[PDB]
Copies of this chain bind each other. A is one copy, B any other.
Amino acid sequence: TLEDDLNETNKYYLTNQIAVIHKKPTPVQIAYFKQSSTTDYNGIYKGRYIDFEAKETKNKTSFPLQNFHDHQIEHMKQVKAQDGICFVIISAFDQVYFLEADKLFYFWDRKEKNGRKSIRKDELEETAYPISLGYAPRIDYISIIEQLYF
């Protein structure tokens, strides 16, 4: 489960003073569950604002785009206009991928022209970066941020 794995990654980065990244809790209107209008994960690494969402699927062929909603994407685009580090982490096809926000916007924006509602495996492998899994941290997405931004 991606969410547990990111909890333990995030604790590991905090505890070792590498980064300070938290998952925002589910909103509750006071009671009922609401739909957040942002991504769930944000925080700081080396001065910079880091913002992402994280989704997994068991589909063997493609990642359904509806795992995300428009408010997430719109927030991500607002983050990008402020020069934030913003992306998604996708667990699919026995791997875990870091997909830059620009690339996710490409897939999101074309989903209405021809019914392309999923990112195919080959489409994801071409556009996204495999993240190295280990024991600790579990999902080392900060090393991708280091490679691409520092």
Contacts and interface: CB of A to CB of B under 8 A. Distances in A.
Interface of A: 14, 17, 19-20, 22, 24-28, 31, 36, 38, 42-51, 75, 78-79, 81-84
A20 B28 CA distance: 21
Contacts of A48: 47-49
B20 A82 contact: yes
A25 B28 contact: yes
9 contacts: A17-B78, A20-B75, A20-B78, A22-B38, A44-B49, A44-B83, A44-B84, A48-B48, A48-B49
A31 B81 CA distance: 38
Nearest to A50: B49
B78 A14 contact: yes
B14 A45 contact: no
A43 B49 contact: yes
Contact of A46 (B20, B22, B31, B82): B82
Contacts of A50: 49
A75 to B, nearest CB: 7
A125 B44 CA distance: 30
A36 B25 contact: yes
A22 B83 CA distance: 17
